[model samples]
Target: NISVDKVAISDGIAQVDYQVSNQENQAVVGIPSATFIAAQLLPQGATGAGNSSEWQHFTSETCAASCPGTFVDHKNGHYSYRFSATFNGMNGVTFLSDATQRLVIKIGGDALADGTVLPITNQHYDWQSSGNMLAYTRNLVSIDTCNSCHSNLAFHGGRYNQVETCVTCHNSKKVSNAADIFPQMIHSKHLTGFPQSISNCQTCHADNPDLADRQNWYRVPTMEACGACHTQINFPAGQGHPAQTDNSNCVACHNADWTANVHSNAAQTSALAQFNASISSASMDANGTITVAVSLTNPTTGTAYADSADKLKFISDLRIYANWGTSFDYSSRSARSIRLPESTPIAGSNGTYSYNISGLTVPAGTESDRGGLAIQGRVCAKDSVLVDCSTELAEVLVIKSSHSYFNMSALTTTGRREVISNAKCASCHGDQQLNIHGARNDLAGQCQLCHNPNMLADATATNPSMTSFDFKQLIHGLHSSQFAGFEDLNYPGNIGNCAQCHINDSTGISTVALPLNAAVQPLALNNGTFTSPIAAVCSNCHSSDATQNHMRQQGAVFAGTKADATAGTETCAFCHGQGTVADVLKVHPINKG
Candidate 1:
C-alpha cells in the first residue's frame, strides 16, 4: 500500500489513478509499462472516396473489444485502449470541439464485442476500488508542471536565454573550427571567456527560459564554484594548456559578451599567449625612430606568443598608434604622424607589427610633458577597415620628468591641469565623477586611459598580464620598464601597481576611474573577454617581429633583461636633438630591422 500522484486534462473531463494493495500470500504482477496505440483518423463527414484501406484498418481484429489478437500484454491487471467513436452532433465541429468528439480512450474493450455497440462516450468513466477513496487524476498539464523537475534553464544563467536565436549567425558556413563548432566547444566556451564572441554572458546568469529582459538577470552559483575543466579530457585547457584554477579571476578580463559569440576550430592554437596587446609609451630617439613593445593573444587560442615564428597574422587585427594624446580633444586626439605601417593593406589583414617609435620628435603641440602619451591596439576583424581606424585605446605616460624614480606616481600639478583643461578624460576620472586618488591628481586620466578596459585585466581580456606577462617580457630593456633614473626600479615587483590603472571601488561593475575614485571598486576580474587578453589587445604589437624591430630603434623593452623582469633605458641623446651629449654618445643604428 502506498501513496500515488497523477495529473491529466481540461475541466477534469478525464481522470487517471493508481491504487496499491498488498495481498498476503498472493501472486503478483510486475509494474506496468503502458503501451501507446495510435489511430490515424479522417475528419468526420469526409467522403471515403472508395478508400477501402481506411475502412479495413480498424476491423474487430485490430480494434474490436478484446477481439482475437487485440489483447495487449499489459502487465498490470488493468488494460487501457482507445476508441474511435464519433459524437452525432456536427454543428461547426472543429479539431478541439466536444461536438463530434472522436478523440478518446475506452477502458473495457472485452466488455463490448459487437460492432453495433460503442464504449461509453461523452460520460466520464472512472475506476473503483474496494476501500480506497481516491488515488490520481488526469488533466491537461501546465507548463509549470514541467518546470518542477527540468528547472534550471541550462544557458544564460537561469535566464534560459536559448541558442534558438543564435542559430542564425552560427551555422556550418558562418562560424567554423572544430572546437568552436561542436558541443564540447560550445560547452567549453560557455565555461570560458571570449568578450567579442558570445561566450560568457550566462556565466553569472541562470539561462532562465523566460528571461524577457536582461536588467532583471542575477548571478547564480559563485564563479569559483564552477570548475573550468570538469574532466581530465576537457578540450583546450586539458591538452597541456593552462589550467583554470581558483585564483584565476575569469571575469577579470571577460565581460558579459564573453559567452555570446563562440565557435570552435580544431586547428586553432593556444589563445592565452596571443592576447597581449598594450598601449605603451614609445620613447623616440632623436633620429625619428620609435620602438613599441606590444603583447597579443593567439586569437585562435589563449596561449601567449612565445615563439616569434608561431604568431599568426590576420588571426587578430590591430591598429598602430598615430598621434600624441596631448594633440586633440581626449576624444579627438591628433594623429598626424601616425600612419598605418606601409605593409598594411587597405582591404586585407595587417600582419601584427610592433617596434620602437623612433626618429620622430614629440609633435609640434602634443608633448609628453603635458599628459600621458599612450599607444593603443584595435582588434575586430570584421569592421575595422583602416589599420588606423578601428582600434581600442590604451595609453601610457612619455614624459621627460625628473621624478622618474617614483614608480607610477601622479602626474605633476601642471600635467594634471593640462590634461583636464585640454582633454575631457577627466570627466569620469575626476573627483566630481569618480573622486578617486588616481583621478584626484589629474594623472588618473593618463593611467586609466590604457591600464584597462583591461580593468586590472577584469574589463580587459581573458589573458591579462598576470596570467601571461607577454608585454613585460618585450619591454624588459626599454625605458618604460625602467623608472627614469632609478636603475634598480626595473624589477617584476616594480611594475605598475593596480592603482596605477584601476579605480578601486567595491561595486560589482568594473569601469575606468582613478585609483581614488568612488565609481567602482574590487573590480570583477574576467578570465575570458571581449577577447583573449592576448589576442584582442596585445597580439597586434609585441608579438609581431616587425613591431619588435620598430621598438629596438625607438627604445622599448619587451622582455626583461633577465628572466626576473629586468628593464633597461636608452641614452638621453637618443631622444633629444643632435648636439646633446646623450645623443652624440649613443650609437646611431646598429640593428635596423
Candidate 2:
C-alpha cells in the first residue's frame, strides 16, 4: 500500500512525499519511478450528470534527469517524487486551480526497477489543489466490486489494478482514440463476451449505497457512454435515438428513471414475490403413499392465498415433485410430479391444501432414508400486479424453486448432500438469472433430483465421452467447454476454484474435498458398466490417456462393474484428499481460508 503524506507546489513544480508499506505495515524499499501520472479533475457543471467534468492527464516524467525532477528513496519506506513542470496549463488545457487533482503510482510487477520481490502494487491519491479537504469527487464502483466477477482484474501487464488509477490516464485529454477512453473501453469489452446479461447495469453500476457516484450510469447519459454500447446509433448523424446537440437537454427525454426502469427486472421480481409456496408438512403412509401439505401465500400481505392454487387467478402454473432415497442420489432419475392446477386436492381448508402421490417407490433397504420434495411454478402478471392468465395476456414469472426433505417413518429432514448454493452461483450468473429448464433455479437441491446417480450414459453415443448429463459430469464438462454448441458456457473465473461454487455444508466440511461421501453412487453407463465417482468427475477435465492411466494405476475403474466401482478400489484420496499437499482445496484457486 502507498499513502501520500504531503503535497506541496511552488514555482511551476510539484513535490509529493509518500510512503510504501507491505501487508504487514513494514517498510518496502528499492522501488522505482517507472510509472506515475499527474491529472486534474475539470470543474463540475450545473446541468445533468453528463458534463465536461473529467480528468486531464499531465506528465509522468518525474524521474527524468533532463526535466530536473528527481526521485529520492529515503530507504525507510518513505519516498519523494518531484514533477518537472506545472500540469495546470499542459497542452494549453488550463485546469481549475481549486478543483480536484489526482496522483497515481505503480510499483513492482513490470515496473520494478531492481531485484525486489515485492508484489504488484497500485495506488492513487486524490486531493484538491487549494487544500487537503476533497473539494470534488469522481468515485465510482470500487476495485473490490470489479474483483467480484473478474477475479484479480488487472491491466497493462499487471501495472494497474484499480479504477481510480486507470482513470488518471484514460481521460479524453490523454487518449486520442475514443475507444481508448476508460468508460468506452470497459463498456465495449464487456459487451463482447460478458458472462451474464449485459443489459443489467447493476452488474457494474451496482446499487451500492456506500459508493459516491455509483448511480452515474443512469444519472449521467453522455453520448460517449451510451453510444459505446449502443453502437448502431450515431449521435453526430442522429441515427438511432433522437438527435440532440448537447447533453444539457438529455434529461428532458431520457431521464434517470427511464434508464433505470428499462434496465431493471423490478416488475417481474415484484410479481413473483407475490406468490410464496412451501411444503408445509409431508409424511409417507405404510403403503408407500406420501401425503404432502402445501400452502400458497400472498407474501405481500403475509396471508395465505384466498383461493386454491387451481382456482387462483394469478397463478398460471404450480407443481410439486417427490422423490425418495435422498442419501444415495435418489430412488430413480425421474421424479414424480403433481401439477397443482390440474389435480384435485384430497382435502383442504382455508389456505392449506393436502395431496397424495401413490407411486413414490422407496427401495426396501432404504425405507428409513429421507425423501425429497420440491416446488416449482410460474405466475402471470402485468407490470407489478398479478393478473388472471386466462383473461389477460401477461408476463410469465417463474417463482424461484424451494426444497424440503422428509422421512417416510419419522418425518425428519434428510436432504441430499449439498455442494453448491444458489447464492454462490448468483455472484456471476446474477440472482435467479440461471433459470434453466424453466423454473429450476435452486442450484444445490433441484438439479440432482432429476439428473441423479441412476441416469445412464449411452455407450453407443458419440457426443464426447467427456460429456454426460449425470449432474457432476455434466457441470464439469459444460464448464470446461467439452460439449458442442455449449462453448458459450465458458467458465469465467479460475476453473480450479472449487469454492466458487462448492460450499461448506452444515457440518463445516466443504462439499468438494475428497474421500467421497459413502452414499455417492458410481456413474452408471447404459452398457451395465460404471465408473468410480472420483474417476468420473476427474475424467471430465483430465480425459487424456496419461491421466486415465494415472488413475487406473490407483485402482480407479472406468466401464467396470458396479461391484468393482463400489469395492473401495479407488485410492485417489490417499494423496489428493482434504489436507494433503496437493489436496483439491489446496491445489485449486479455491478460497480455503
Candidate 3:
C-alpha cells in the first residue's frame, strides 16, 4: 500500500513524498521507483463542448530511467520524487490553476531495485495548483464499488489498479476517440451483456458517501453521459430527442428528480405500497380443499381495501401457490396455484375475503405435515398513479413476493428449512431486482414452491436442463451457463465460492458442506430413473464424462431405481463432508460472512 503524505510545486517542478506499508501496516522500505500522472479537473463548459467536468492530462513521468526526474529513498518507508512539470501547452488542454489538480502515483509491482516483489498499488492526492482550497472535482463513483462486480479491475498490464488514476488518462483530450472518455466508456461497456437492468443507473452509480458528487449521475444530466446508454439519441441530429446544440438545455427539461424517477423504482414503489395481501388464517379440509382468509390492505394508508383482489381494477395478476410435505422437499411437482384476480371470493367482506382452492393432492401419510404458501402478483400503474392494466398499455410493475408457512393440522405458522438468503442473491443481483416469471421474484421460497425436488428430470437423465425446473439443478445450471441459449450468462463473482449462496443451517453449518440434508431427495427422471442427490447437484457444474464415471465409482447412482438412489450407496460424504481432508468447504474458495 502507498500513501501520498506531501506534495509541492515550485519553479515549474513538482515534488511528491510518499510512504509504503505492508499488509500488516508495517513500514516497507527499499522501494525503488514510482510512475506519476498529473492532471487537472477542467471546469464545466470550459471548452464550450458541454456542461460536464473532465480530467485533462498534464504529464506522465517515471523514475525508473528518467533523466528529467530524481528519485530518492529515505532509507525508511518514506520516499520523494521531484520532476519537471509542464501544465500549459500540453494535450491541447491548458492547466486551470484554480481548478482541482490530482497527482496519481503508480508503484510497487514485480521486483523493485532490491529484488523484493511487491503488489502493485495506485494512490492519488488532490489539491489546487494555486495552493488554495480545491474548487472542483469529479468523484462520481468509487473504485471499490467497481471491483465489487468486476472482481478485480486491474488494467494497463495490471498496473493501473484504481478508477481515480484511469480518469487522468481517459479524458477526451488524452484519448483519440470521444467514446474513450471515462463516463462514456464505462456506460457503453455495460450497455450490453450486463447482469441486471441496464436502465438502473444506481447499479453502478451507487450512493457513495465518500463521493460528494455521487449523485451527479442523475443530478448533472449531461448529453454525453445520458447519450452513452441512450445510443439511439443524436442530440445534434434530433433523431430520438429534441434538437439540442449543447448540454446547457439538458437540465431545463430533464431534471435530477425526473431522471431518478425514470431510472429507478420510485414510481413502482409508491404504487405497489398502496396494495398488500396477507394470509390471516387458513385451513385444509379432509378432502384437500384449502380455505384461506386473506386481508387486502393499502399499507401506505395503514387501512384495509374495501374489496377483494378480484374486485380491484388495478390488480392485474395475483397468485397463491400452495405445496405440502415440506420435510420431503414438497410432495408434488404440480403444486396448486390459484389466480386471485380471477377467482371469486366465497365469503366475507370489508377488506377480508375467504377463498377455497381444491386438489392439494395430499400424499395420505403426509396430511399432518407442514405446508408452504407464497403470494406473488403484478399491479398496473401509470408512473405513480395506480391504473388498470388496460389503461393505454400502462406499466405493469411486479409486486414484491411474500411467503407464509402454515401447519396442516392447526394452520399455525411453521417455518421451513432455510438454505439460502435473499441477501446473498442481492450481493450480485440487487435486492428483489430479478423478476422470474413476472411476479415470482422470491428466489428462496417462492421458487422452491414450484421448482420442488419432485420436478422430474429429462427422460434420459444424461443431460440436465432447466426443463426439469429442479431448484438446485436449475440454479446451478443457470449460474454456470450450462443451460442452452443462456450461454453468455456472466456470473461476475467467483462461482467456486459456495458460501456466496449457501447459508449456514440452524446448527451453524453451510448447506453446501453437507452429509446431504435429510429432505434432499434424488433427482427423479420421467423415465422412472433416479440419480443420487449429491451427484445430481454437483454434476450441474461438473458434467464431464470422467467426473460422472468417478461419481458412479464412488457408489453414486445415475438413471437407477429410487431404491438405489435412496439406499445411501453414495459415499461422497466420506471425502467431502465436514472436517474431512478434501472437505467441500476447504476445496472451494468459501467466504462465509
Candidate 4:
C-alpha cells in the first residue's frame, strides 16, 4: 500500500512525504533509490491554452548524496521528496487563486531481502490547495475498461497501472521534440501495432452515452491525435491545411458544427434489413436438390417484403448456399446460387422469397451420419445509402437415410452458456464483434447456437491442423496459435492468462464456474481422434499427454470399456470440483502471492 500524507511549498522548494508499507504495516525496504520511487505534480483544473500543458517532476530524498538535495529517513518506512523550479511568483510556481491541484505518488520495487519483485506498482492521489474541491481533472477513461484486454494493464515493468498516475507524469512537456505527451504517446504506439484501425474507437471507448459523446472522433481537431486512428492522413503536407494556419482559420473549416454537416451530407439511413434463410425447414429432393425459402424484412418496422423481383430496384441480388458440414463455416465448400422464383410476393408486400437449391447431396460416407449438416442463405438489397447491403442467415440440419432431423431441443435445453462477455470482445473488436462468417449481431452466447462440440473443421483440408470449431477450442486456438495457419495470431500475454476472459471465481483469482452437467468435448489426442467426452473442460486448452496422464492417474470412475478412452467418460469434478484440494480454481490461480 502507498500514501501521501504531507505537501507544502516554501521559498521555491516543494516538499512531499510518502511511504510504502506491507500488509503488516511495516516498511517495505531494499528498494532502489531513483528508479523505484517516483512522484509528479499536476495542476488540477488547469484549462489548457491551445494544445499546451505541463506537469512538474519531483525527486526522491534518498538521492541527496549524489545531488544537491537532502535525504531524511524517518526511521520507519516513509521518505520525502523536494521539488523546486524558478518560474512564476514566490520564486516558484504560483498557486491558482481559486483552483486546487493534485499530487500523484507512485512507489514499488524489489521488496524485502529475498529479492521478490512486486509485479504491480501502487499509486495515491492527494487533492490539495486550500480545499478547493470543485477543481479536478475530468475522468475520461477507466482502468476497468483497459483491463478487459490487458488483464492487469501493468505498465512500467508491471508497476504503473492507474491512468491517474499515468497522466501526472506523461504531461505534454515531459520530453523535448518527441511526441511524448500521453495522448500522442498512446496514439503513436498503437498506430502500427493495433490489430484493428482507429476508426473502430469502441476498442478503447466503452459504449456509454457520456463516453460516446466525449469521443467525437470525426470532430477531433489536431492532426497528431487524428493520425493515431486515421493513418492515411498525410499531415503537415496534407492538402487540408491553410497557407497561413491559425486556430480561428482552422476552426473555420474544422469544428463540431462543420464536421456534423459534412457527415450528414454523406449519411445513410440507420434502418437496416435482414434475411431469414428458412434452413431449419429445408429438405433435399431425391436428386439431392434442396428447396429453401428466405424472408427479407425491415425488422425495425416489422414490415417484410413479398418479392425481390417485384421491387427490383429495392432488391439487387438474392441467393442461397448450402454446405454439408458439422457447422456453418465459411471456408467449408463452394457456395452456389439458385434460380429466382416468379416475380411475386408470398403474401402482400411482405418480402418473402423462395428458391429451389440444386446440386446439394449428402456426402458419400455420410449416408448414416447422425447430426452434422448445415445450410446457409443470404440476400442483398439497396439501403438508403444507395449501397448494396446484404444479410446472412443459417440453420443446422441433420440428414438421415429415412428422415431428415432438425430440432430445437439440443439448442433450447442448454444448462448455461454465458461465459465470455460481448463487452469484453468489444474492448478490441469494437463494431466488428465476431464478424467471422458474416455474423455481425451475434453475441458470445448466441455464437454457441452453432459452434457447439459437434462442429468440426478438417485439419488437413484447412490451413490449421485438425481443429474443432468447439467454442473453447476455436477461441483458444485462435488466440494462442503461433503457426501461420492461424495468421500468427496471439493475444498479448501467456495463453494461461485466463483472466482476459474469465473473472475471479469464489477462490479469489481468475477462474470460471463450470456447470455440473455441461456438455463439453473430450481431449483431442495427438492423432486425429479425441479421447472420450469428459466433464473436465480444462482439457480443451491443456490437451497434452501429461495432462491426460494426470487425469487418468487421478482415477475418476469411468463407465466406458473402450481401449484408452475411458477417462473421456468420467467427470473430473470427482476430485477437481469446487472447494476440493485439487480444485481447478486453485490449480489455475492467477493472482500473485
Q: Please give, for residues 498-585, the per-residue lDDT of candidate 1 as tens digits.
A: 1222232343112111111111111124432222211222232233433333333213322221211111232322343334434321
Model 3 Cα displacement at 530 (Å)? 2.3
Q: Provide the TM-score for each candidate, comma-separated.
A: 0.21, 0.84, 0.83, 0.64
Model 1 bad stretches (over 4 Å): 1-275, 279-281, 284-291, 295-318, 326-328, 331-354, 358-593
Per-residue lDDT tens digits of candidate 4, residues 1-593?
Answer: 33333334432223342444323355534333333444445463325435323354333235533332222222222333422211112212223334545454445443444555453445545444544444444344556556555655667566664545566556543444356666667777766645554444545655555432344443445655555555555555555533433222444567777654553412222322233323224444443554444554555566665555435432343334443322222112243344343234333334555455555445554432222223322233233222333333222111110112321122122223346555545555543333446422334343444455545444343223226666655776677663236765547544676554654334443343334233333333233444333423454465444343464432322234243233343345456555555665666635431
- In candidate 3, which residue ranges exceed 4 Å CA deviation? 6-50, 58-99, 107-132, 155-159, 162-165, 388-394, 411-414, 459-467, 506-509, 515-526, 552-555, 559-566, 569-571
Q: For model 1, what is the error of residue 316's alpha carbon versus the real structure, in angstroms, after optimal superposition?
A: 7.4
Model 3 local distance difference test score:
0.66
* Lowest-sum lDDT 10-residue window in model 1: 398-407
Model 2 gets an lDDT of: 0.65
Q: In order, what lDDT does every prediction score?
A: 0.26, 0.65, 0.66, 0.42
Residue-pair clashes per prediction, in order, are 155, 0, 0, 10
Candidate 1: how large is its RMSD? 28.6
Write the number of the candidate with greater lDDT, choosing between 3 and 4.
3
Q: Candidate 2, residue 581: CA error in Å? A: 3.7
Shift of residue 258 alpha carbon in model 1, Å: 21
